Amino acid sequence: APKVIVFISGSCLFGAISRSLFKKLPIPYTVVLLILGAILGVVASNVPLVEEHTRDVAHMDPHVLLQIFLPVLIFESAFAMDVHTFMRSFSQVCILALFGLVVASVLTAVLAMNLFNYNWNFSEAMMFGAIMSATDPVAVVALLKDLGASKQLGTIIEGESLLNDGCAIVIFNVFMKMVFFPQLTSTVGQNVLYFLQVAVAGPLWGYAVAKVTVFFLSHIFNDALVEITITLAATYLTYYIGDIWLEVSGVLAVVVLGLIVNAEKTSISPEVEVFLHRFWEMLAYLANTLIFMMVGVVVTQKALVAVDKMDWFYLIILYLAITIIAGMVISLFSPILSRIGYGLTWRNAVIMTWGGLRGAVGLALALVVENLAGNDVIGSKFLFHTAGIVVLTLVINATTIQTLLRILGMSDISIPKRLAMAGAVRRIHEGQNRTLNMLKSDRFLADADWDIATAACEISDPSPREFADMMEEARLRMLKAEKISYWKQFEHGMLAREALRLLVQHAEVAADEKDQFILVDDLKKSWQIKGIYPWLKRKLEDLILRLTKALIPKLILVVNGKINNQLSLGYDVGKGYIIGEEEVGKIIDRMVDNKKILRELKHISETGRLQVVKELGLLQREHPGIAVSVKTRQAIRTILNHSRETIHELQGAGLLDEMEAHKLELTVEIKMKRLMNAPSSIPPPPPENLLKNVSWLAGDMKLIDFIKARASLLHFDYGEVIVREGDESDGLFLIVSGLVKLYGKVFEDYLTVGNVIGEMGVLTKKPRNATVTCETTVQVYFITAEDMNIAIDTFTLYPSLEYRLWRVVAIRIATPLIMEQMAFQGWTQEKVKLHLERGYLVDLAESHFQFNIDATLEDVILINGTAYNAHTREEIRSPCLISRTVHKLTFQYTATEEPRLFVVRNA
């Protein structure tokens, strides 16, 4: 009877002990596992009882490693990394990893044939070279996360290592079949059919199974067990069919399935995702520790008997050669990746050629060769060299990668993240100190030992020359302010993960730029990359065997989704840059003191803002329906994010527990899941629908009837001028289609479909502010001024039309004042807009044209009329913010400027 319980339980215990002991040291814990296996091998060789309890797991069948261990390791490597970043980098990852592995394998094989004194064939040498080009990603990314360096390097290394592992597995299988089973014959047609099966139909089978699984899982809400069991059964069935089809080369199907499933954010709830990740992590951890123990035992028992000093010399030579050829291939193929438009730096390449740590895939393949060789010495040589190379890499490269990162300067921390962390932990410490001072004076806790409490309230704490000086300080100021603004926008819930990554990466790239602060052309490449052949295919299918007829409309949906996935990123990037520039425009005046410097800074910032807003406007013009769809998605996403923030704030006030927190977060996540299933092609609304969607027109059917019965459609062509400066306010416009340029006294702005021009001209009855000119063929809605006066005099409800118009223009006027006057550390544009939305407009007629100032209200803004105060005879003219010290506001009644105040109350 085989005995396996003691070995596996002892391996679990040894893995735990070695994991805990060597966490602080930079050397990985797996070399300790190999050492323990070696000691156990000596003991089992010299003691028969330990041999009886060791040999059943130490020398297993090679099909255990080929059919159980290796698929688990490779699938966990695929399943434990980000998928969207891999998709964004695959165009270079594929070519780099595949051709680098091919050249490295061929060079190592040639070195084995011509330098090693063993009379090895070409197939044995190619098996040898495929074994020793198979890196380990998890150790490298653990080191990178521990050192806190850039994550783009981490995901690039992860993708390169996964492709290396897959190609090495395929090449090893192909040459093992030739070396150990020579009865099988090969022809050119059979070889090309085998390549077509392995490289094309395998991943296609995995893709199909993953798609069917995700389609089935979408129909299931709030069921973790069903999702977990269905995902695991689909994984097993994919592996099983691919296995009985392609032997060891059928791992690409489950690799593709893992990549597809890991990218799911709607059909699979986050708790299911974290359970599946921990499940596969534990399985791969067990396989790793078992493999290292048995390779230690077998190396000690068999390999070290038949080695000489020449084998050690060959080991050192091979260790030098693999690093040299890796550096050679990366240096040779770096210019080719540079010419394609997505290159890599020099420091990143230096880290890349050094972080090639070998792992358990090569050790498993060497164990397979050792089992299959039998009494031949080739298996012993394979195991000796593979174990030596693994030990040398884990001993040298793992310790020197942190040294190289420190020397090369990639270990620095980003300033906004450090500032946010420091502010959070200092706020935590101040709150804890306040709690301590509260507790020390308690009537009941007046007898405790306060030394323990004071020790336990501690956090882990995670001339033209001067002109050039101020201009470089201003450049640094814009860089850091843009960085913190983009971070705040992401934290509020505006920017997406990909959009935030692109924005901060471009900011880091452009920090060293001196000609321009932020180039609009890179952002243009970010959003103006549509028009790709999917769009032409969609047009062709629109202008265009019964199953083919049924399948034709089903590609329209998928190509619409493909266009949407890029339009959303482009819109997010452009909107984030616009909001960041608008936020930095306010704080840059207070801190920059040189008049000419701030003049040219404002000039370049303004012109960049006009270019990005114009480009976004024409981009919306080009693709209407997908634009409407992504705008709706963004609106509902922001609504859900603010609901989540409301839940968190209610938790922070001590009014709701984690049970109800999960209960309401589940409803929010369900709403998000049903949102992501919405159609991605909403047709553009008719102009009457947009007229019914005006902010100060909704809620009153008779108002919309009155407006639509007496409004006019006006069409304008290129270059037309609708209104000019100083003209009498003829009426209120509404841009319902096209782009329009509003410029004059000397500001500029570009307005699009859905905006209203002339609210202030109709309400306050002053002439036009600036000249409005044409850009495209614009259709607008026209309502005359006398029309609007009649409409104002008609409706007199509690939310009257005049009140709504004045509230809209009041928030519009008061947002810059509130933002500029209280631009503290943490006052963003959206926070100011929401705070003003919490306010209301005060009618002073009911208060006998007088107003008091309390302490509960936060802001009081004078927007129309002139404010007076008998106390010290204060006089304030609109538009201005009322000072905190004025306590009485008296107003006069005059027909030219009615007194209108906008106040904000607190909770």
Added chain:
Amino acid sequence: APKVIVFISGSCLFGAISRSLFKKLPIPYTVVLLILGAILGVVASNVPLVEEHTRDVAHMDPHVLLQIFLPVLIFESAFAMDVHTFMRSFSQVCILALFGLVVASVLTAVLAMNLFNYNWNFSEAMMFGAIMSATDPVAVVALLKDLGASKQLGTIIEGESLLNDGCAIVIFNVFMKMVFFPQLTSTVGQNVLYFLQVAVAGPLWGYAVAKVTVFFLSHIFNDALVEITITLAATYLTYYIGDIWLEVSGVLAVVVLGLIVNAEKTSISPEVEVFLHRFWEMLAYLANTLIFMMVGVVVTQKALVAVDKMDWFYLIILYLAITIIAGMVISLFSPILSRIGYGLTWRNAVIMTWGGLRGAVGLALALVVENLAGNDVIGSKFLFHTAGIVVLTLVINATTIQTLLRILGMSDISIPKRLAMAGAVRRIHEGQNRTLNMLKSDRFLADADWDIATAACEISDPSPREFADMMEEARLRMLKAEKISYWKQFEHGMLAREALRLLVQHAEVAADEKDQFILVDDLKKSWQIKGIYPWLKRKLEDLILRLTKALIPKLILVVNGKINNQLSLGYDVGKGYIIGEEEVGKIIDRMVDNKKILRELKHISETGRLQVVKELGLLQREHPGIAVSVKTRQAIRTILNHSRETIHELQGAGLLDEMEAHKLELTVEIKMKRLMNAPSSIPPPPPENLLKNVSWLAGDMKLIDFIKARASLLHFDYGEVIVREGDESDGLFLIVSGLVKLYGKVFEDYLTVGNVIGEMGVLTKKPRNATVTCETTVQVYFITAEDMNIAIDTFTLYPSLEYRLWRVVAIRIATPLIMEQMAFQGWTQEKVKLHLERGYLVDLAESHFQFNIDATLEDVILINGTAYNAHTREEIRSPCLISRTVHKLTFQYTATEEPRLFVVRNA
């Protein structure tokens, strides 16, 4: 070659389909699984290919069910329930479940022997009864959670079902060995040794393994993989040794191990706990669905061939009989456990005798008997009757339990939980509406389709007669106010889960009481329980083979922990009642309008408060060191809870992401884990340690030296009077040991160690306010008033001694004023104290004896002196809260009452 892939994959798919389809219906989804298995059995009987793909899993070895399925089901039943409540109910759960199951098994066996026409022995009948007396907890607790009834009933049902399952497994094993393997002989000594092995040494082995595992896991921080793998390997090794020892009756060891491990909140991380729970949930789910499929197949193929109408008649009779005998045994044994003190009600007794749903344990045992019987008809009869009873229970009892719950009136919701949910969802809706109004006027999102957004912002929405009328309304007001106050105290983070449960359960019990609102003795039974054997054992060991000498000090630690586990609950319960009573007393005055009624209510509430505070003080006097330890634990726990609340509030302001949220929450949880490992016996600190721990003395070593150089230690016996009303303030006291009663003009309070008497009489130099009398022999620290004046004149730093004394007495004075004036819905006592900690005493000598009023400061309290205002000639006398409308504060300089103001600002 056996074929098992199609059957298991189809069972997974069928379980998913039946789970999703029958979620809304109250009938469980497992009857659909049995129906599908029956159809598959018919098809496989009539088609040879389906039989070939079915018979390998449909007819498995009985050792698969005995060694794999049943341990998994029983361990998951043990592992998936709260354990602390199981200890709190075990004293009745053990006797009720064990004796009820024994009587039910014997009655069912007698019914099988005498009524069924099958000539069955006594051992076969007892096997029958043990099979039919094994219930199922998961279905009934799912129904109870869906209907939202009380959770104590669910806990009782879970424990009763787990004991039923364990002892039914034991009885079935014992009688199966006699029925099917009669070569084994039995004697009295062998039987009693077998009982000693099964019932005593098995659970002891499980307890020992669980304790060693928890001790090993305590030494590992921030390692999920090591904890998960070590816990799972310990579970397997416990099961394996208990299995090879006691066959099927060795499941009690893993049941005990699961119960112990489920209690771990420090050594095992919450993420590890949720992973392990989901893991065992999935394993038990697979076992359940597989069992139901094979029981359907085998019932159709074999059982339904040898069944007549008499068998159906016997099935109905047995279904009536099992329910009748369950009701009979619960009604007979209800008075016995009612006389012990902890009884059960009538409605709960009616409900719990109906929720005896049979499940997969009895089905697995019937399948085992079917496999072992062979060609005999006894196995077919067992399977037929067990399947029929399972079907009848799942069809009748599961549908009628919700009807009985609705009729009996326990489906109601608690008022504070409903109010909290309603407030939270309405705040969410208001925030979403504000976000919608913000988005509809955006310059960029002015083209989206707003119907989708407006539809998607929706929440799931989860005469003496009149005198008696007002008194009953006042009783309802106290009940609701106490309930909401206890809930708020729990949510903030002082009340423990057990303490909150006890408090709300006693409130619900006492809601119908008319003699008293809350009985003090019912809580004395909650804190005064430690007059038991552990205290005397600790005393004996204190006043008291080398391993025995080393083990003697190690029982002191465990008995100290056992005392602490009850002292903490008592302190939490008493403190929660005290705080809730204070809050309701501060809030009941504005609500009640009858003067005599509120006078009597205040009198009775005050008397209750004095009794509970006196009892708590004497309890602290009884056990000093454990009391100091629990007070320190409570202080650090409150500090950590407020740090967690700070993290949540920072997230709710949109300044921190989930990654950094988990990063800092991990540090907080690590600090909590290292706090829970602290010693549970801190010796009482010396009196000088208390003298150096005063709130207005810390931070200045010279101050403590000056005080200690001229302080006096005063001893008093029972009945002594230290100060009386109207006496000149001789000095400042400090109670350093004992209890003291401060009563007079007509309030009354009880003070203990660590409190200071006479701060106001020294600071303001007015005579004493109330007479201070003695309760126990008190040691106090006395400092003369002249020495205090000298110390005041000596130290003149920025945080001067006079400033600290005035700040302490200022917060003490101003807490009731703020907590009474503006006690809205959501302002608790700790909230007022924490808000007041942010304030400061403002200095008017620097400000030329005049003070302005800002619009950002929240509270301004006049505490010393008289406040004046030339505007409208306002005059306010201390102590009073400054009205919101007063804008100017001017003060005069007079030696009798120096003007001291306490102001509060915001962030």
